């Protein structure tokens, strides 16, 4: 959403547009913020190492859980 | 032999202190287990049993003492109650489920957070050191008395 957003394309519309083409096309089916529409990212020369991804989900997810547990924040003064 | 140097290794120095702190205590309680081969039952089962016993006592005992002993028992049912909350399970449904299944399943009916239901502690593998609960009933209880006795917090200036 942010991608199409910081590109001028309608976030909500661009997304659902991708969601469908992602089921018809392939996993590579992404959003080319330089064509104004969906396209095969694998052919657009845009790939990132699986690590960055894997980490991303884990890093932020655990945190969300680390502060979601804190039922109190009292530390005198 | 007659010594064992346990070398701990954790991710960060923060998890190292905890891992070492936890071990020290984990070893302390075991010292209690090697000085007493007795084990009660968790899952609030122990307390749930007391909560019922004391109650039966707070009945055939006239005078305001019945009220106190009654509040004492109810105060114990909090162990399992909280154990459910912290788990995500509704305490109300647990307090009743555990309490009734306790007068029918003996001191072997405790709470299972992982299953969100009451089960058997002796068959599940949930056994605690007697020394632990022993203190609790002696430390906490009597302690409340002092703070309860003190009806005046005076001071110089």
């Amino acid at each position: 959403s942010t991608l199409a957003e910081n590109a001028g394309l309608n976030p909500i519309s661009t997304v659902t547009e991708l969601r469908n083409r992602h089921a018809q096309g392939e996993k590579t089916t992404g959003i080319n913020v330089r064509k104004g529409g969906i396209s095969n990212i694998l052919e657009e020369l845009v790939v990132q190492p699986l690590l960055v991804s894997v980490s991303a989900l884990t890093l932020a997810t655990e945190t969300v859980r680390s502060i979601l547990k804190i039922d109190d924040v009292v530390n005198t003064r | 032999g007659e010594a064992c140097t346990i070398v701990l290794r954790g991710a960060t120095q923060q998890i190292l202190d905890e891992a070492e702190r936890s071990l020290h205590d984990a070893l302390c309680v075991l010292a209690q287990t090697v000085k007493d081969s007795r084990t009660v039952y968790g899952g609030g089962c122990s307390e749930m049993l007391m909560a019922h016993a004391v109650t039966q006592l707070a009945s055939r005992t006239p005078g305001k003492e019945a009220v106190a002993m009654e509040s004492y028992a109810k105060a114990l049912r909090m162990l399992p109650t909280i154990i459910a909350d912290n788990a995500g399970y509704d305490s109300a449904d647990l307090v009743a489920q555990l309490r009734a299944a306790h007068s029918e399943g003996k001191t072997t009916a405790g709470l299972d957070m992982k299953e969100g239901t009451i089960g058997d502690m002796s068959v599940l593998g949930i056994t605690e050191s007697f020394q632990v609960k022993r203190q609790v009933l002696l430390s906490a209880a009597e302690a409340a008395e002092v703070i309860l006795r003190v009806d005046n917090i005076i001071k110089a200036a």
Binding site: - | D151, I153, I154, K155, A157
Partner: protein
């Protein structure tokens, strides 16, 4: 106009009178909550940070930050109550304030303060006189002596071994009973062992070696023992003893009223108002116990006329019971002293109608 520099308050008549009645009656109701076996301890926390949890009043009024002049006096009654007989340090404080709660009313009748002293003093004497009548005169009677030492060591951090401490206190006093003197019986605690290892170093001199766990636990055993050495010394110096629990206060309170009738003039209302105050003590007992002070009192009074003034209030059985039989006795000098300090003290209050408050 400013006839005096604004640095010395000055109340007028009922202005000061009333200020003292409340004040001295206030600090009084403070100790009443800690009177009896089921006494509610207090937590004194000075400006340093040292928490002081005690029951005795002298130990509470000593840590208590007191600027009020009238309150200072109440601190000298309990203090002097602990330096003489020791036990019942709170009583004098509670009794004193009680004599105020009664005096005030009389003052409302227009009864001049000074005159109020009449009844209070005339009744007090006869009150102490009625004690010499209902007092028990025991005999080197090792039996009665040790029995009293145990009653002064009961309900304290030395009640677990009050039997040994009683023996040590009785021998220490008997060896210097040349006519005894509490100046030839030194004490000395020491960490190590238990409270059962306490011995008596020998004997116009006796060194009491007290052993105990922590340093605090020992301090209470030494404190219970100190009062034990005073009580035993009181009876040995005065073969007079009575029964606590309240029975005594009930007997006097009854006698006073009666005598108040035989005596006309305003001194009548005073004496009566004096006796009624002799009930605040027994009433307080049933209070700090858990029973209704009103129901108990009257229950004890009816049973006090049917079984002589030997029956009091059993704060452990919840109801009337004979103190004598229950082995609940106290030295005579104690009660004879209690009434004095408290009363005499009070006499000063009424005699003060000014005050020059500092800051």
């Amino acid at each position: 106009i400013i006839k005096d520099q604004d640095r010395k308050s000055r109340l007028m008549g009922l202005e000061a009178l009333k200020s003292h009645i409340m004040a001295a009656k206030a600090v009084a109701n403070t100790m009443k909550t800690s009177l009896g076996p089921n006494g509610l301890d207090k937590m004194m926390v000075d400006k340093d940070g040292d928490v002081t949890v005690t029951n005795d009043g002298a130990t509470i009024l000593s840590m208590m930050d007191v600027d009020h002049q009238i309150a200072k006096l109440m601190v000298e009654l309990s203090k002097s109550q602990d330096d003489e007989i020791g036990d019942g340090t709170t009583g004098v404080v509670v009794l004193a304030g009680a004599l105020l709660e009664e005096a005030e009313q009389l003052l409302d009748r227009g009864i001049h303060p000074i005159r109020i002293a009449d009844g209070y003093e005339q009744a007090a004497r006869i009150a102490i006189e009625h004690l010499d009548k209902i007092s028990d005169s025991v005999l080197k009677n090792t039996e009665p002596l040790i029995q009293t030492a145990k009653t002064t060591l009961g309900s304290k951090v030395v009640n677990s071994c009050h039997r040994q401490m009683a023996e040590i206190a009785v021998n220490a006093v008997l060896t210097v009973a040349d006519d005894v003197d509490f100046e030839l019986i030194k004490v000395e605690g020491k960490v190590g062992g238990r409270l059962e290892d306490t011995k008596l170093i020998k004997s116009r001199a006796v060194t009491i070696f007290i052993r105990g766990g922590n340093k605090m636990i020992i301090e209470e055993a030494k404190r219970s023992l100190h009062d034990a050495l005073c009580v035993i010394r009181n009876l040995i110096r005065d073969n007079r003893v009575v029964y606590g629990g309240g029975a005594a206060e009930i007997s006097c309170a009854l006698a006073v009223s009666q005598e108040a009738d035989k005596c006309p003039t305003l001194e009548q209302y005073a004496m009566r108002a004096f006796a009624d105050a002799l009930e605040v003590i027994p009433m307080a007992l049933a209070e700090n116990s858990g029973m209704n002070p009103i129901q108990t009192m009257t229950e004890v009074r009816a049973r006090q006329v049917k079984e002589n003034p030997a029956l009091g209030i059993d704060c452990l059985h919840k109801g009337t019971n004979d103190m004598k039989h229950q082995h609940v006795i106290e030295t005579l000098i104690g009660k004879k002293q209690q009434i004095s300090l408290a009363t005499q003290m009070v006499r000063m209050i009424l005699k003060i109608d000014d005050i020059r408050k500092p800051g």
